[PDB]
């Protein structure tokens, strides 16, 4: 047959890429030799095209102007701080070690210094639970307990724009416009509606998958479609 | 009595034991961080170099070339192929890594000609060979009774035509009798059956 859609994707052509040339800023934590003496003032609040959520512009003491993954409640004028001694308020970024347990955190680092990886979507937030001289236990937004180095820096508060998913798109046109700002091919045609040549589910006189939808993890790309390595399906039982 | 050289050679008969071993475990660390072709002022294996034609003189260059290990990096067929030609994984190239190194080096020095090369070890995923090249235009060499032969026009691009030592061996020209029916005088003359 022909490569299925998932295979055209990898090639990274236009249709499948994100309009990076239209993105504002690779939101990443600042760096500080140490001390923590760093702090800047919120200058503006902008819309981040890449995440359909607001981001805050900031000017630091050393005259450094950069956009920041904004938590909720951060307004212009506000003064944020980034360092080991940074105050324990919303908006400030500091190593989990200095953050008190039970505090909602966002934009957490996987490895200290990576500048943030976890919890960065609209309104999500991690949860610092356990402290240790060795491990800091964070409960990610997926509900998973993540064991992190207490040296991994993170921002206090929950990500801004929460509740964005509550309103339906209502019409194709609204998806269209949003989709156009992401690295995604849209709309979606179901395999079952295609020709056998184009997808493992294609063909037939009527529309239905030609085999059970649950595919093996070891399946080769081109054949791995439907329910990937499903531990189970359905809602019952 | 034993010559100094002999010791260098005797040390490489076993590149995994003794000092040489510790030496390698170190050098590769820097080699790994070097390029594909690094000119070097002195041969790592002096005996071998000298043995293959090397001379501390002008127009005589040495360079370490790094080449990957394993079979051929091949692309699977994109059209009809009987089961015999559907192979990908087990296929291997007919040119040994050492000949590949000799070529990659010579290409780095378009004016020089490959005199010879020798192995200097390998780690888990690559092999290093030091290639001895010669400047066919330097008078220091045009007048050397032991190397001026490499200056003749017909010695141009000698490595790309398999006139090198590892070249001729790889072409299966070692034996002068049995087993060399399809190899000498030339592979292509024997219909590519060697």
């Amino acid at each position: 047959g022909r490569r299925i859609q998932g295979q055209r994707r990898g090639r990274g052509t236009s249709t499948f890429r994100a309009p990076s040339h239209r993105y504002k800023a690779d939101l990443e934590h600042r760096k500080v030799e140490d001390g923590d003496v760093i702090a800047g003032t919120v200058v503006d609040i902008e819309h981040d095209p890449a995440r359909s959520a607001p981001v805050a512009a900031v000017e630091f003491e050393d005259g450094d102007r950069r956009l920041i993954l904004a938590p909720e409640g951060v307004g212009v004028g506000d003064e944020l701080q980034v360092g080991v001694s940074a105050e324990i308020a919303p908006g400030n970024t500091l190593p989990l070690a200095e953050i008190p347990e039970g505090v909602p955190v966002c934009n957490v680092e996987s490895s200290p210094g990576d500048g943030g990886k976890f919890a960065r979507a609209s309104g999500v937030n991690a949860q610092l639970l356990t402290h240790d001289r060795n491990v800091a236990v964070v409960k990610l937004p997926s509900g998973e307990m993540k064991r992190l180095d207490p040296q991994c820096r993170a921002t206090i508060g929950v990500v801004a724009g929460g509740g964005r998913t509550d309103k339906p798109f209502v019409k194709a046109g609204n998806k269209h416009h949003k989709m156009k700002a992401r690295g995604t091919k849209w709309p979606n045609v179901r395999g079952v509606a295609m020709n056998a040549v184009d997808h493992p589910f294609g063909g037939g006189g009527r529309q239905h998958p030609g085999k059970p939808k649950s595919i093996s993890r070891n399946a080769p790309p081109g054949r791995k479609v439907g329910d990937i390595a499903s531990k189970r399906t359905g809602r019952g039982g | 009595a034993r010559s100094a050289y002999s010791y260098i050679r005797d040390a490489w008969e076993n590149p995994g034991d003794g000092q040489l071993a510790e030496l390698q475990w170190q050098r590769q660390q820097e080699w790994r961080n070097e390029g594909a072709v690094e000119r070097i002022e002195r041969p790592t294996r002096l005996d071998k170099a000298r043995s293959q034609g090397y001379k501390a003189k002008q127009g005589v260059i040495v360079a370490r070339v790094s080449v990957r290990k394993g079979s051929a990096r091949k692309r699977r067929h994109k059209a009809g192929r009987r089961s015999k030609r559907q192979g990908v994984t087990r296929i291997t190239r007919r040119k040994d890594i050492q000949r590949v190194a000799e070529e990659r080096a010579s290409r780095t020095f378009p004016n020089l000609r490959v005199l010879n090369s020798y192995s200097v070890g390998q780690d888990g995923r690559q092999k290093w060979h030091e290639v001895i090249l010669i400047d066919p235009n330097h008078p220091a060499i045009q007048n050397d009774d032991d190397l001026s032969w490499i200056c003749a026009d017909d010695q141009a691009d000698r490595v790309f035509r398999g006139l090198t030592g590892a070249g001729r061996r790889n072409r299966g020209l070692s034996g002068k009798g049995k087993g060399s029916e399809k190899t000498r005088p030339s592979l292509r003359s024997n219909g590519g059956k060697g």
């Binding site: - | 009987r82 089961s83 015999k84 030609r85 559907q86 192979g87 087990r90 296929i91």
Partner: protein, 92 residues
């Protein structure tokens, strides 16, 4: 059918009638060193291996008699033609 474990008959070796004993030829184990074994390894590579890619045939409804006739005096056995027989049992 039933068949005598022992009985008189011509021994092609002694060249005279003597008491032979009948046994069922037991399959001899292979050494995997015969030419055919070599050619298999030798001629088997990428893709279909030709004759070496084939598999076991089938069975006839009934097999023929595969027996060994051993002379009671010189101990030298001899082979005979076989006959189709669904089952062969020796008497005594």
């Amino acid at each position: 059918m039933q068949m005598p474990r022992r009985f008189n008959t011509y021994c092609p070796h002694c060249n005279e009638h003597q008491e032979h004993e009948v046994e069922k030829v037991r399959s001899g184990r292979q050494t995997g060193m015969k030419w055919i074994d070599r050619q298999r390894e030798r001629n088997s590579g990428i893709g279909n291996d030709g004759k070496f890619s084939k598999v076991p045939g089938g069975d006839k409804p009934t097999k023929k008699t595969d027996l060994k006739y051993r002379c009671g005096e010189c101990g030298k056995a001899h082979l005979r033609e076989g006959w189709r027989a669904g089952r062969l049992e020796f008497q005594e």
